[PDB]
Ligand SMILES: Nc1nc2c(ncn2[C@@H]2O[C@H](COP(=O)(O)OP(=O)(O)O)[C@@H](O)[C@H]2O)c(=O)[nH]1
């Protein structure tokens with residue numbers, strides 16, 4: 001009989017008018033757009049700034065989530081960096097079933113971390129698609145992304161099933177708490 005709250009109300013408690021800018025990144029198919037629509041927090045808008053490169057965005061009050069795929073795509077790395085401007089947090093999403101592409105994801109993740117503009121970011125990892133038989137454990141995704149060895153930044157790896165909205169409250173609550181200090 002008990003019911004979840006709407007993220008709309010959750011965001012009111014968590015951020016409530018505060019200026020927040022998070023970027024949610026990952027390899028294509030990790031589950032990022034799914035997380036966006038599953039939040040139900042406003043319209044998503046897109047800009048395709050090149051014939052290949054493609055960015056999505058959502059804002060609620062003064063919290064903005066900016067979203068793109070990372071990896072392959074020639075190497076459009078400079079076209080991104082504009083979008084890191086005064087970012088508070090990174091959400092990096094991983095397909096926990098895709099054992100093959102995780103080295104790539106760790107590489108990519110590791111490149112975001114080393115970018116100057118990400119020095120002081122809180123880091124949330126969604127180890128997504130945990131519903132799938134034989135996927136990686138959240139620890140195995142932690143290990144692989146090298147989160148043990150980590151700077152002085154606050155980080156957290158969170159199990160998720162994005163298509164059921166599972167894990168999302170937990171990660172976002174961590175993120176919100178972490179960010180207000
Ligand atoms: N089984 C499962 N499938 C998922 C999950 N999250 C996303 N997907 C599916 O993975 C595909 C890509 O998701 P999408 O959100 O477009 O990935 P994006 O490229 O990261 O934006 C879609 O078919 C989703 O339904 C999950 O947690 N479990």
Ligand SMILES: [Mg+2]
Nearest residue numbers: 029032033034
């Ligand atoms: Mg997408």
